[PDB]
């Protein structure tokens, strides 16, 4: 508990030393997280909960098939292709769009 975190912080204070170099400034900035992580992939963080390529574009599992001969199902195909071609939106907002249409169509 607080004794081990107190021991950790007092160990940190007694191993705290002057920076004495700009490379060590960069070292401490990497340690804190101020400096960017390198080599950089333009996708640092941003896991999107391990979506892994099928939840983004294959929306049958959230499509929840109606009679597929209907114009409602045709609209579902259209919006499914659109949400598949979205790269800026993720699976969670894709399925809340889908559920918004489900709710409104059930309301009507």
């Amino acid at each position: 508990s607080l004794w081990d975190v107190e021991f950790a912080k007092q160990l940190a204070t007694v191993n705290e030393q002057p920076l004495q170099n700009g490379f060590e400034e960069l070292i401490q900035w990497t340690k804190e997280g101020k400096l960017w992580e390198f080599p950089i992939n333009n996708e640092a963080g941003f896991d999107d909960d391990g979506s892994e390529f099928h939840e983004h574009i294959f929306l049958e599992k959230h499509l929840e098939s109606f009679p597929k001969q209907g114009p409602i199902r045709h609209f579902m195909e259209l919006v499914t292709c659109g949400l598949s071609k979205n790269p800026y939106l993720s699976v969670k907002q894709k399925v809340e769009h889908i559920e918004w249409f489900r709710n409104y169509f059930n309301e009507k």
Partner: peptide, 22 residues
């Protein structure tokens, strides 16, 4: 590939672009 399967005109292919862009 993932676009619309059945033949559909541009006037709903546009809805697909609307849901494909922001």
């Amino acid at each position: 590939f993932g676009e619309v399967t059945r033949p559909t005109n541009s006037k709903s292919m546009k809805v697909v672009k609307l849901f494909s862009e922001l």
